[PDB]
Design a protein around this ligand. Structure first.
Ligand SMILES: [Ca+2]
Ligand SMILES: [Ca+2]
Lengths: 62, 149
């Protein structure tokens, strides 16, 4: 539902970014609900491109 | 919790100044990430760049640290997210987080102010209590109200 809100706490911030990058490096595992929130470009995969898109959003360029 | 202090500096019109952003009360499990927004007046300050401070330990700082400058929006944005994925590049000590480089455009005070904060988390993703102290350039510049020393 709320794209970018990886941890599902209702706000999009850099803590979601940490969670996203650690999951992409397989340092953590996401819950299924979190996976839907993590796929920020909605292409069906969670990867480095999602990390970069979320970073751009947090830097407010988009 | 964490205290973020914007330094206070002085400088003549036309000169470049550096405004440091200090971190205190760094958590026992470090800072894995932080995002926040400061406000500034582009009539007073032309922000030419923001450099990472020495508490950014990633040997390639741009992997962990990025900023954005918006003169039209009158804001500057900070994004830190330690890039190791293991907590290795987290912030572990108090010190300078960033240095804001600005050319002084007028003698009026050039306040740099806390606008918004997202999250400040440690290596366990525990969000921290955070407070800000505003600062900027020539903070006391004013028309005198009386005759005084
Ligand atoms: Ca969140
Ligand atoms: Ca994706």
């Amino acid at each position: 539902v709320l794209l970018g809100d990886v941890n599902g706490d209702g706000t999009i911030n850099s803590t979601d970014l940490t969670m996203l990058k650690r999951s992409v490096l397989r340092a953590i595992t996401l819950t299924d609900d979190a996976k839907a929130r993590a796929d920020v470009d909605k292409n069906g995969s969670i990867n480095a491109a999602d990390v970069l898109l979320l970073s751009r959003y947090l830097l407010r360029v988009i | 919790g964490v205290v973020v202090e914007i330094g206070k500096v002085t400088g003549s019109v036309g000169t470049t100044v550096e405004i440091p952003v200090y971190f205190r009360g760094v958590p026992s499990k470090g800072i894995a990430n932080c995002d926040f927004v400061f406000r500034y007046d582009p009539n007073v300050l032309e922000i030419i760049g923001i450099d990472p401070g020495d508490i950014i330990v990633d040997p390639n700082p741009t992997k962990s640290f990025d900023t954005a400058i918006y003169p039209d929006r009158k804001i500057i944005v900070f994004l830190f997210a330690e890039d190791s994925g293991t907590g290795a590049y987290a912030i572990t000590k108090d010190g300078v987080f960033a240095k804001i480089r600005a050319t002084v455009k007028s003698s009026a005070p050039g306040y740099i102010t806390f606008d918004e904060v997202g999250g400040f988390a440690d290596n366990d993703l525990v969000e921290q209590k955070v407070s800000f102290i505003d600062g900027g350039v020539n903070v006391g510049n004013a028309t005198p109200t009386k005759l005084e020393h």
